Design a binder for this molecule. Structure first.
Ligand SMILES: O=C(NO)c1ccc(Cn2ccc3ccccc32)cc1
Ligand SMILES: [K+]
Ligand SMILES: [K+]
Ligand SMILES: [Zn+2]
Length: 635
């Protein structure tokens, strides 16, 4: 029953600043914070967020990750003049101190804990803290790289201590390596740390051997540390999405964290003077989106870096938009990760293969343009159960006709289905059309679910009506066996079929997954979802998703499926379920509407299934480059 998104912020954290000439520190300015709140205010997103107030972290809380000695040294800095502050700063690397910075660091820390309490008490579903100074570089007894105290380290330890959590995921998508966080949880298997970061074969700051893919943790923590070094600059949306689909999410869903914490630095975004990567802000709408099915949505985004004041606010707004569940922007031009990225992706996968049952088969050889507006839909979701059925609906849904819509069904009938008169089927067809009309052209409805009786006529009308809408491209996800009125010959339709009997597949616009039924089914299905289905879908960039389920269908995966596949097509998905099922219709509507998803926790899948999936990657990765997670073989 949790709802809303906290936005923790306070203008006091912008009242410390660099007080002497130092060109390497110039970039880290108070204006980073004011630009960010103001952007969220301009776009109406700050107003939609519960503004939880900042507090100071207590001394007892700071000692969870820091040392009496180093805390007492920093506690002395508010009494210092500028000479003394320069001297204290020079005992550390890439960090300046200010009379007010111990004050703000305590606030940046306290703000993060405020976010943790709000999320874990169900007062909000998720949140984001706009803090200065950053956290992820600082260590138990030192400040480093603009950080004083490790705000995200605090959050996990705090959430460990006061909520008795066993599994916490920390995703550090900042462009620098959060070495403070890795040090803190090195031997700890209850806090899984994933970081990607600019490395350039250790030439990039902080220049640490520990930053490479080979550091997997120590002792009982081996496997619970994951570094993905970028060894070239200019990494693109396709490189970030490849890292999620083929490293982070496979490990994240098997881990099944009880809470997700993001070190969200946006120096990894296009335009940043320190990161020099090429991902558009829109990418962060999806990095957020892809993780929200974890831990029932309990996500704590915590600002780290970001230095181009323009690129900064755009990426913050994309993250909060997604936190509030607004529709995700379509990403165009996705394709293969570059060669350096595939090398890094392939190296970390191989070294981690001893630890995760998603890479296990790898071990035994058998300046840029503006984002476009994302206002949420009038009504998010439209439901059309059988006539007579009426269950209760979330606050943002609605039941289903028109005269125009009725002339089409008659028009469609006489042309293509002359020998059909079932006034029930012909109702479904009217519903499909009218619900698609409200999705494809009105910004009013987002997605919908229609229960249907005859599948073949329902799908045909759904599909053909969408193509003339115009929908340049339609992705079709079908769970069932048998033929289906689909023409996957031109580039306008891609079909994903999940069936029980295998099928030699000729066409390359198709992905047929035959999963040997059993206890294996759920674990393997979701390897294929993150490993194959999402990467193809993302490259395809559909205008509309059409989900279909035949009546002889198991169910425990459809919510994750529905939640994730809404990253395509600005969330415009129509779902045709054949036959009434209270539970499935309830689950489909719940996921479509933005609700949180029940986690899965636990198995590992059958080799006949993982081999079936790698035959599919082999058969498709040359058409669909985003499927690649190795370097191409050169002639
Ligand atoms: O945004 C960040 N991290 O998340 C981050 C960005 C840039 C730096 C580099 N840098 C800053 C001052 C200085 C002095 C000497 C050597 C290097 C230095 C460090 C950290
Ligand atoms: K990072
Ligand atoms: K760890
Ligand atoms: Zn950074």
């Amino acid at each position: 029953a949790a709802s809303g998104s906290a936005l923790i912020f306070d203008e006091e954290m912008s009242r410390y600043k660099l007080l002497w000439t130092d060109p390497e520190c110039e970039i880290e300015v108070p204006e980073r914070l004011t630009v960010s709140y103001e952007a969220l205010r301009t776009h109406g997103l700050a107003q939609r967020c519960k503004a939880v107030p900042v507090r100071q972290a207590t001394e007892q809380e700071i000692l969870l990750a820091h040392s009496e000695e180093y805390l007492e040294a920093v506690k002395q800095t508010p009494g210092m003049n500028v000479e003394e502050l320069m001297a204290f700063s020079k005992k550390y690397n890439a960090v300046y101190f200010h009379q007010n910075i111990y004050h703000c660091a305590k606030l940046a820390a306290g703000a993060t804990l405020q976010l943790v309490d709000s999320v874990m008490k169900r007062e909000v579903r998720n949140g984001m803290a706009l803090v200065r100074p950053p956290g992820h570089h600082s260590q138990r007894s030192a400040a480093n790289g603009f950080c004083v105290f490790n705000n995200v380290a605090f959050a996990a330890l705090y959430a460990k201590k006061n909520y008795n959590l066993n599994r916490i995921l920390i995703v550090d998508w900042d462009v620098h390596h959060g070495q403070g966080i890795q040090y803190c949880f090195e031997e700890d298997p209850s806090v899984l740390y994933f970081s990607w970061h600019r490395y350039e074969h250790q030439s990039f700051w902080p220049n640490l051997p520990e930053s490479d893919y080979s550091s997997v943790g120590k002792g009982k923590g081996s496997g619970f540390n994951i570094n993905l070094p970028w060894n070239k600059v200019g990494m693109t949306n396709s490189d970030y999405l490849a890292a999620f689909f083929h490293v982070l999410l496979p490990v994240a869903y098997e881990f099944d964290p009880e809470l997700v914490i993001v070190s969200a630095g946006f120096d990894s975004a296009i335009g940043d003077p320190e990161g020099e990567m090429c991902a558009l802000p829109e990418i962060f709408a999806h990095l957020t989106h892809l993780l929200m099915p974890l831990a029932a949505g309990k996500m704590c985004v915590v600002l780290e870096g970001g230095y181009n004041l323009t690129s900064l606010g755009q990426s913050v707004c994309q993250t909060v938009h997604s936190l509030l569940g607004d529709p995700t922007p379509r990403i165009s031009g996705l394709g293969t990760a570059c060669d350096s990225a595939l090398e890094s992706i392939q190296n970390v996968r191989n070294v981690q293969s001893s630890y995760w049952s998603s890479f296990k088969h790898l071990a035994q050889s058998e300046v840029w343009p503006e984002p476009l507006k994302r206002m949420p839909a009038s009504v998010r979701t439209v439901v059309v159960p059988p006539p007579g059925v009426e269950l209760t609906l979330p606050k943002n849904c609605q039941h289903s006709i028109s005269e125009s819509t009725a002339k089409e069904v008659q028009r469609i009938r006489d042309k293509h289905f002359h020998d059909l008169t079932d006034q029930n089927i012909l109702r479904s067809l009217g519903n499909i059309i009218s619900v698609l009309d409200r999705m494809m052209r009105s910004d009013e409805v987002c997605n919908g679910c229609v229960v249907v009786s005859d599948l073949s006529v329902s799908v045909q009308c759904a599909l053909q009506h969408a193509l003339t809408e115009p929908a340049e491209r339609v992705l079709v996800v079908y769970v069932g066996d048998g033929e289906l009125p689909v023409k996957t010959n031109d580039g306008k339709v891609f079909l994903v079929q999940i069936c029980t009997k295998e099928t030699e597949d000729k066409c390359v616009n198709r992905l047929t997954l035959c999963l040997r039924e059993g206890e294996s089914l759920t674990a393997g299905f979701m390897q294929a979802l993150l490993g194959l289905i999402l990467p193809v879908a993302y490259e395809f960039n559909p205008a509309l998703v059409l989900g279909i389920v035949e009546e002889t269908a198991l169910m425990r995966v459809w919510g994750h499926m529905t939640c994730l596949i809404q990253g395509l097509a600005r969330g415009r998905m129509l779902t045709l379920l054949q036959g009434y099922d209270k539970d499935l219709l309830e689950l489909t509507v719940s996921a479509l509407s933005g609700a949180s998803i029940s986690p899965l926790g636990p198995r590992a899948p059958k080799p006949e299934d993982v081999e079936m999936m790698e035959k599919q990657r082999q058969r498709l990765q040359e058409r669909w480059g985003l499927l690649r997670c190795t370097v191409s073989e050169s002639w």
